[PDB]
């Protein structure tokens, strides 16, 4: 967006020397067929679980008897004759 | 799951030596096809001496 000075001014670009047109034309590189070589394992030994871990651990219970129930000797009351 | 363009590619360290110096003239080492060359170093073995 340059304003024409009309006292001074100029022409298009003239022929410059050049640099040696087929030396800024490249090649087009070439690519040969590539294998990821090996045979692949099929797992591997890793150095971490890979399932889900518990943040507290809970208290666990089994349920037991307690044995064969026998009778007693109470001490007995007195009789309610009238002082009770 | 495996990046296969990124295990394909390779990315080397490769050294030279070139001879043949004037003095006061351009001594030019080409860059060659197909590479992508990341870093250029140029060691001045001028006789023995640095």
């Given at each position: 967006?340059?304003?024409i000075?009309?006292?001074?001014?100029?022409?298009?670009?003239?022929?410059?020397?050049?640099?040696?047109?087929?030396?800024?034309?490249?090649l087009?590189?070439?690519?040969?067929?590539?294998?990821?070589?090996?045979?692949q394992?099929?797992?591997?030994?890793?150095?971490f679980?890979?399932?889900?871990h518990?943040?507290?651990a809970?208290?666990?219970?089994?349920?037991?008897?307690?044995?064969?129930?026998?009778?007693?000797?109470?001490?007995?009351?007195?009789?309610?004759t009238?002082?009770? | 799951?495996?990046?296969?363009?990124?295990?394909?590619?390779?990315?080397?360290?490769?050294?030279?030596?070139?001879?043949?110096?004037?003095?006061?003239?351009?001594?030019?080492?080409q860059?060659?096809?197909?590479?992508?060359?990341?870093?250029?170093?140029?060691?001045?073995?001028?006789?023995?001496?640095?």
């Amino acid at each position: 967006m340059a304003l024409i000075n009309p006292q001074f001014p100029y022409a298009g670009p003239v022929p410059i020397p050049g640099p040696a047109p087929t030396e800024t034309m490249p090649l087009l590189n070439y690519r040969v067929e590539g294998r990821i070589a090996g045979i692949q394992q099929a797992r591997q030994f890793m150095p971490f679980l890979q399932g889900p871990h518990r943040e507290v651990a809970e208290q666990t219970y089994y349920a037991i008897g307690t044995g064969i129930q026998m009778g007693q000797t109470f001490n007995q009351p007195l009789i309610n004759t009238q002082e009770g | 799951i495996l990046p296969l363009i990124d295990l394909s590619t390779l990315y080397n360290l490769e050294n030279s030596a070139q001879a043949g110096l004037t003095p006061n003239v351009d001594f030019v080492v080409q860059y060659a096809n197909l590479y992508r060359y990341l870093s250029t170093i140029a060691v001045f073995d001028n006789g023995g001496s640095f």
